[PDB]
Amino acid sequence: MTEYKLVVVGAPGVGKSALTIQLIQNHFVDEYDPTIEDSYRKQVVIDGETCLLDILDTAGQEEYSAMRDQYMRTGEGFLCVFAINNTKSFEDIHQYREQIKRVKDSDDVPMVLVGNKCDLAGRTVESRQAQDLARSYGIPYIETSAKTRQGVEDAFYTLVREIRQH
Amino acid sequence: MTEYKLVVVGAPGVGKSALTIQLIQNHFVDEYDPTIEDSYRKQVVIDGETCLLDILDTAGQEEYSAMRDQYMRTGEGFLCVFAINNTKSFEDIHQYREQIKRVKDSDDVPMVLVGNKCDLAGRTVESRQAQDLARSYGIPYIETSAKTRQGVEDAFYTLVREIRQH
Numbered sequence: 001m002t003e004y005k006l007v008v009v010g011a012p013g014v015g016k017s018a019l020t021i022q023l024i025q026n027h028f029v030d031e032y033d034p035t036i037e038d039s040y041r042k043q044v045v046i047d048g049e050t051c052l053l054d055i056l057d058t059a060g061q062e063e064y065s066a067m068r069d070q071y072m073r074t075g076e077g078f079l080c081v082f083a084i085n086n087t088k089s090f091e092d093i094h095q096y097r098e099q100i101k102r103v104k105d106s107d108d109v110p111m112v113l114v115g116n117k118c119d120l121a122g123r124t125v126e127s128r129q130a131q132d133l134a135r136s137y138g139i140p141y142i143e144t145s146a147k148t149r150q151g152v153e154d155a156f157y158t159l160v161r162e163i164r165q166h
Numbered sequence: 167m168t169e170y171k172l173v174v175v176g177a178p179g180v181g182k183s184a185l186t187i188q189l190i191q192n193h194f195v196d197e198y199d200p201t202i203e204d205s206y207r208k209q210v211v212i213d214g215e216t217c218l219l220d221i222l223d224t225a226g227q228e229e230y231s232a233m234r235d236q237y238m239r240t241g242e243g244f245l246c247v248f249a250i251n252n253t254k255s256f257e258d259i260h261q262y263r264e265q266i267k268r269v270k271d272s273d274d275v276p277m278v279l280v281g282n283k284c285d286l287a288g289r290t291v292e293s294r295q296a297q298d299l300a301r302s303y304g305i306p307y308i309e310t311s312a313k314t315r316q317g318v319e320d321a322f323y324t325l326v327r328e329i330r331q332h
């Protein structure tokens with residue numbers, strides 16, 4: 001069956017893992033539990049197609065840089081996550097996007113911009129400025145909460161459909 | 167606030183109304199109740215943006231043709247619906263798409279291809295052939311059930327995001 005190699009990237013603490021586990025395990029993780037590298041494989045049906053989601057959950061620290069080019073070159077689509085309560089994480093997105101273009105040799109790689117933690121009241125990144133960013137990248141923007149499970153499947157399925165039209 | 171003029175089109179009986187009412191009224195209509203013209207307006211928040219969905223639910227009969235160019239020229243985005251248990255409705259999609267391109271003077275209008283009734287076991291249209299169609303149109307394909315509410319918000323929100331990147 002069709003397999004789709006999705007990679008979840010973003011600054012430390014933005015909720016990369018919480019999003020992935022919500023999707024795979026249908027629960028929200030509230031623990032402090034830094035990722036080195038985690039892999040998830042799940043048979044799903046998306047718009048009638050039976051496919052396997054092969055998801056690589058990454059670290060965002062500078063440690064993981066070398067290890068980073070390796071997984072970026074094999075990923076077919078990337079979830080670029082920031083936290084809406086964290087302006088530095090929003091600004092970091094540009095760093096991840098430009099590394100992915102570098103290793104993929106491509107101005108256009110299947111990508112979704114994900115503003116996570118949208119359940120939180122103390123937002124410091126406006127949805128309008130994340131939406132102008134995404135438009136300038138020519139990619140979709142989707143706001144998610146791993147807590148309420150708002151937007152989680154939307155963010156992942158949208159990325160799969162971007163890979164499909166590539 | 168931003169308003170988005172969405173138009174729902176497709177052959178008679180495909181579930182145009184059932185999709186719209188699921189979204190607006192959160193119930194599934196099982197009655198035989200042909201549409202002439204229905205309008206729905208709903209304030210929603212999609213990816214953090216406060217916007218008004220202004221939805222025009224249409225008829226698919228040849229009656230409604232003249233009335234059709236009128237609403238197609240004011241629509242910003244179109245849901246093109248067929249039924250997965252109805253091969254003639256799938257084949258009709260080409261007729262609706264080409265009328266919309268005609269009136270919009272455009273090879274690319276924001277559009278989503280929606281295969282409805284995906285809860286039904288007796289499918290006559292494979293998801294693979296609807297997906298090749300959609301790719302040849304350069305638009306997303308999304309399978310929905312107005313009955314189970316599978317894919318309903320996905321189909322509408324995806325169309326809004328297509329309008330946003332246009």
Ligand SMILES: Nc1nc2c(ncn2[C@@H]2O[C@H](COP(=O)(O)OP(=O)(O)CP(=O)(O)O)[C@@H](O)[C@H]2O)c(=O)[nH]1
Nearest residue numbers: 012013014015016017018030034035117145146147
């Ligand atoms: N309220 C709220 N908190 C969230 C959300 N998603 C993640 N969190 C919280 O933020 C913290 C970090 O989540 P985690 O999933 O571990 O993030 P990470 O980006 O994967 C961290 P690392 O880069 O080290 O791998 C956790 O306490 C988690 O519960 C969300 O949508 N809402």
Ligand SMILES: Nc1nc2c(ncn2[C@@H]2O[C@H](COP(=O)(O)OP(=O)(O)CP(=O)(O)O)[C@@H](O)[C@H]2O)c(=O)[nH]1
Nearest residue numbers: 178179180181182183184196200201283311312313
């Ligand atoms: N099981 C199933 N039946 C559905 C679904 N959506 C619509 N139907 C059924 O199909 C019939 C037609 O639905 P309706 O929403 O009226 O379709 P329409 O395309 O709007 C009809 P008209 O073109 O005349 O306006 C109804 O009996 C409705 O309950 C669906 O996802 N699943």
Ligand SMILES: [Mg+2]
Nearest residue numbers: 016017034035
């Ligand atoms: Mg993590």
Ligand SMILES: [Mg+2]
Nearest residue numbers: 182183200201
């Ligand atoms: Mg109707």
